[model samples]
Target: FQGPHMSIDEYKSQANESMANAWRIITLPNWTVEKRGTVRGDVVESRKVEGFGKVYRFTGVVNCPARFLYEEFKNNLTKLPEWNPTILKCEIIKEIGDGVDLSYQVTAGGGRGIITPRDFVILRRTALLSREGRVVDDNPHGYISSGVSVQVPGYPPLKEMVRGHNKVGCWYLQPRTVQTPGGKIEDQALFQWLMCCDLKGKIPQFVLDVAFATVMLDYIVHVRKFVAEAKARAEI
Candidate 1:
């Protein structure tokens, strides 16, 4: 389908709707722990969503402030493929306005090529959140980057690659003072992601369970390692 040039206002409203969906799902208390324990592992949880299947929640700690992590994801988006091997490419299709854009990304195939590479066209939006962990208008304490799939003119699903839809996904970074058992509150950022996608193909449900969980596992590790290198390199 050929889409008209979307106006800034149209993109703005859609951004809010997408982020709201992310906030709602993240706040849902019905998540079951899928993976636990440390050892370079992310705290993972799974929750079933109607119409969208299962959504996974991933949380990890970054050694930097919340704003720093947020800005990195926003400004350094196109450079993700250089560090994160899971993302083969990240292309900015167009920038609509402040905190809103069209992005096309390619995911590397896993499971020894049984899971073929998939591509997504997402309308990505960024916003800040209040200390209470809700979307805010100004001077927020948290950061959120959200994405939902949309069809764009001249960017139809590729014949050689499978098309994937990010139903409702978000990367949320928040500053925290974690009280460790040693009686110290960490001066760190908490990175949380709500990932729900439809990886279209003939892949079975059993295989997807493994693939999606692995996807989160790899992402959190990559983020942590990259941030360490990025901070040392003065990229932030």
Candidate 2:
């Protein structure tokens, strides 16, 4: 099933080694806290580490504005199942260059239906990390989007769902400030989410550790209501 498996220099070296393993596990150092707090206002702070292993390393903190939530999570990720109900869908099957691309996802099936639905075929890359000064082009070192798992040409493996794989997907936005020390930056951000899945058949390792920690804190509550309705529809 090697239908155009990989290229584009190995998908741009797996999107630059998945943005350096998502900034080395979002500022490395023995992570291990499987869960933390807050959601609606975005502060889940979920963590669990080692790498490169069991890598559902989550994190959050959103006053929202790391290039407007990284271009609204990289340009409206296929509207993320309308509101991320376990990611029932997502698009962009190809665009292999400028900021790179190739995407697809479908998830929504666990225990209730005996864990069947799941799918992914990624290879995305969006980078730009500069800090200290800049806003028009966005800085404060914010913006990084990565995806690895590959295989191209017309979506395969759907015999009824179960073909998951992502050694370490990513996103590590920045630009944080405003602790009231005469705070400056208005829309803050410091979001991190790096996942690693291989939800193949034969589930039940405590239900895949409760299905990867409740799908990584329900994707921070659908990216916090997808950026609070994108800043209330830009007040447009």
Candidate 3:
């Protein structure tokens, strides 16, 4: 048998106790408070989100003119298999105005688990530009740029998930000038890559971190090796 009701304050206290019990029952006993961690030690200078992955800032100094660096970088795309060992081949599929579609075949060794192809269309091309009101007209085909975003294919229906499916990937190139300690001129080529992907599953967070770290390290190693070779040959 229950006791008779008391004052307003007493009733409030009882209600609060009941609410606390409900809260405990609703939450998992193993639940933990999540906290954001800090990033330490810079590996890639600057990184941004692209369609299905991340675009990392890649820069390497060489002992050549900016024009030469730009030209070499552009031409190297044709021999990607040579410089970028992980890439089997990259073929252009479609062209629309200043943009062109590309299909990249990665090495089987790149093993990032079973990832579905990005639902976004990627395009690549070149562009000319001016900086600080200074017009620099060089190779109109120097830069290689690409864009990525989400897409929907007609035949197969995408699996439903808690979050909407969105992915991204982009690539770009630029010529930069660097000054040597002795005031000598040096060339620096900057490559940009961006990537994003839809993550799902029970432990999706952990899986994504593993995949991201693996891919990022592989790319860094490849680019560093390529830059070292380029610098050695050019004496920069």
- The C-alpha lDDT values of all candidates are 0.80, 0.69, 0.40
**Candidate 3 runs further than 4 Å off:** 1-78, 94-99, 107-121, 129-144, 149-166, 179-185, 199-203, 231-236
Write the residue-wise lDDT of candidate 1 on 1-236 in tens digits: 64565566777788778988887787788788777636444687888987768898988777777887788789988998988898998999888876889888998876455567889898988988886666677788778899998877768898898888889999988787777668976567888899887665668866776766677776777887987897799865
TM-score-based ranking: 1, 3, 2
Model 2, which residues run further than 4 Å from truth? 1-34, 37-57, 61-124, 128-142, 151-164, 180-189, 194-196, 209-211, 214-236
Q: Name the best candidate (by TM-score).
A: 1
TM-score of 2: 0.33
Assess the local accuracy of residue 112 in candidate 3 as a C-alpha lDDT between 0 and 100: 70
- Candidate 3 is scored at a TM of 0.49
Q: Whole-model lDDT, candidate 3?
A: 0.40
Q: Model 1 — which ten-residue stretch has the worst lDDT?
A: 33-42
TM-score per candidate, chains pooled:
0.86, 0.33, 0.49
Question: Of 1 and 3, which scores higher on lDDT?
Answer: 1
Candidate 3 residue-wise lDDT, 111-222, digit = tens: 2763433332333333343332122355442343333321213212335312223233333345667776799776665444433445455546545455554555566566
Residue-pair clashes per prediction, in order, are: 0, 1, 15
